[PDB]
UniProtKB/Swiss-Prot annotation:
Optimum pH is 7.3. It comes from Enterobacteria phage T4 (Bacteriophage T4). Changing T26E: Complete loss of activity at neutral pH; covalently bound substrate. This is Endolysin. GO terms for molecular function: lysozyme activity. Keywords: Antimicrobial, Bacteriolytic enzyme, Cytolysis, Glycosidase, Host cell lysis by virus, Host cytoplasm, Hydrolase, Viral release from host cell. The lineage of its organism: Viruses, Duplodnaviria, Heunggongvirae, Uroviricota, Caudoviricetes.
Length: 164
């Protein structure tokens, strides 16, 4: 297990534009295209992302290319974010994956807003952090995925992903 396998479990793989769990047009492995309700807007974003006129459909290789970009950019962005960088650097490599997963799903600003949970994580108060993380719109709207991520933070193991 690694961050790519983890996010592939949590996000799936779809080669045609679809709506994510917030109703937003997405493709590939959790690649958000736009929050606009316009499918045409989403299609334009897609073509720009891939560099060819797609009308909504990509290949697996293209999906993986966007996914690698998105993971790389999530890590890079964490390391440029004054709230998230110290927490990331304080965490072991398994727990870092949980933080990357959250940023992938909700964006850096969103994660950086979890001030109390971030503190508990940097203090290595794992059970306290896990309790606090669940008191969130995040957890309520995607509870099973949040449970997996939270277990990863609580334990520093892949137990919530091993056989998925
Ligand atoms: Cl992009
Ligand atoms: Cl604790
Ligand atoms: Cl709490
Ligand atoms: Cl879920
Ligand atoms: Rb998804
Ligand atoms: Rb629509
Ligand atoms: Rb580290
Ligand atoms: Rb994403
Ligand atoms: Rb905050």
């Amino acid at each position: 297990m690694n961050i790519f396998e983890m996010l592939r479990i949590d996000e799936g793989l779809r080669l045609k534009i679809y709506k994510d769990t917030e109703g937003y047009y997405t493709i590939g492995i959790g690649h958000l295209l736009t929050k606009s309700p316009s499918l045409n807007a989403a299609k334009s974003e897609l073509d720009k992302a891939i560099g060819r006129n797609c009308n909504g459909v990509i290949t697996k290789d293209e999906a993986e290319k966007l996914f690698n970009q998105d993971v790389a950019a999530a890590v890079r962005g964490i390391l440029r974010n004054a709230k998230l960088k110290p927490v990331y650097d304080s965490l072991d490599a398994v727990r870092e994956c949980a933080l990357i997963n959250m940023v992938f799903q909700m964006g850096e600003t969103g994660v950086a807003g979890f001030t109390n949970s971030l503190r508990m994580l940097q203090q290595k108060r794992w059970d306290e952090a896990a309790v606090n993380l669940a008191k969130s719109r995040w957890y309520n709207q995607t509870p099973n995925r949040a449970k997996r991520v939270i277990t990863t933070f609580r334990t520093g193991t892949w137990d919530a992903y091993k056989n998925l």
